[PDB]
Amino acid sequence: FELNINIINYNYLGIIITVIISIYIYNNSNIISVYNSNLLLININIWMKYNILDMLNLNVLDYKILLWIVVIIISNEILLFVSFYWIYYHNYINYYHVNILILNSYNIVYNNIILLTLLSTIVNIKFYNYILSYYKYILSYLIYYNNYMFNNKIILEYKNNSNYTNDSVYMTSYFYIILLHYIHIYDSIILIVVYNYVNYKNINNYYININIYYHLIEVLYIVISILLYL
């Protein structure tokens, strides 16, 4: 027989990661922060390596445990956006009569909605192929093109906007809510860059996580679009 769980006795990434966090506080140059971020990325990858190596234990509950962890993380991301919506709507009584130019409801909203919908369709096709034990090379490069356009559009919008964060709480909330969504789009790039075909298929937690996360980002933008643009 064997123990139900193969215990993990020792770990040293925790110390390294925690020290990396402290380096952000104790920096005397923003250049150190940039290089420190690479270290954090490296060590987080090692932690992800340990999760993949745990497959050797053949434990049925490992998939379930990680899936429910992601559910909790998703909830935290939703509640973080709720706080920004809370901040935005608290000062609702002070909006729409101040001498600032709010965003148009015709151009930005439509193309972004169309663009992000295509992103969902690409990920949906990836899920379908994952169900069918099949792969299509071009799909990943469609995501990169999709992400390239999103970055190009958002950069221009910020640069050409004629109002600034210090003009009103409305502008601050607009910029902040849009940035928060962008950061979650960038986190999606971090995840999707490693998409590959793995032959153990439906016992791979990465596929279900990516599908859930991409759907969350897109639905959040619908709420943002209704609140700010429409």
């Binding site: 050797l56 390239y148 970055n151 004629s162 860059v193 490693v194």
Partner: protein
């Protein structure tokens, strides 16, 4: 230090006597180059699929999970008795060998960076390309705008080519290089 470090090899005889295993490559047993084999067959070099040659070097990974199984003894190259038993390992590889071991321990991190940098370079190019250009005329005088509201506010939709040329001339006047540039006619 040890013989293995001096003469690195993959899966030769007398591994225990040589003192160390310097290769992370695991598996083999393919009848042809790039064919079906055993083990995962991953390494820094000589694996996967050559883009330059358009040929497969090793087969798809054969995981020890449900989808695969163990590797026959004929083709096992990382003997755990030599792979582990790390007592005295730093003397068997020396300082330089210690440096190589540290670099090779981060193959997982290296693979991610290769797949992660290029899109960031694309995003960075957008910023660099735009930063070179002079900024667009974001705002103008409050009163002058309203005295010609229709032309300025609706000019773009009615005729974007003439409107674009008009913007260029204003930028030339604003930054004082109108006489130095020839704006094409529209």
């Amino acid at each position: 230090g040890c013989e293995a470090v001096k003469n690195p090899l993959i899966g030769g005889p007398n591994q225990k006597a040589r003192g160390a295993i310097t290769s992370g490559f695991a598996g083999g047993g393919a009848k042809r180059l790039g064919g079906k084999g055993y083990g995962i067959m991953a390494d820094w070099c000589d694996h996967g699929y050559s883009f330059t040659k358009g040929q497969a070097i090793t087969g798809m990974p054969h995981w020890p999970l449900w989808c695969g199984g163990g590797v026959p003894d004929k083709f096992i190259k990382i003997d755990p008795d030599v792979h582990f038993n790390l007592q005295g390992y730093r003397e068997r590889i020396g300082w330089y060998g210690f440096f190589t071991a540290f670099l090779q321990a981060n193959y997982h991190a290296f693979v991610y960076f290769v797949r992660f940098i290029p899109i960031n370079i694309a995003i960075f190019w957008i910023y660099v390309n735009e930063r070179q250009r002079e900024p667009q005329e974001n705002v103008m005088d409050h009163e002058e705008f309203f005295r010609d509201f229709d032309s300025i506010y609706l000019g773009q939709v009615f005729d974007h080519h003439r409107f674009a040329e008009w913007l260029a001339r204003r930028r030339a006047v604003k930054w004082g290089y109108a006489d130095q540039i020839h704006i094409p006619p529209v």
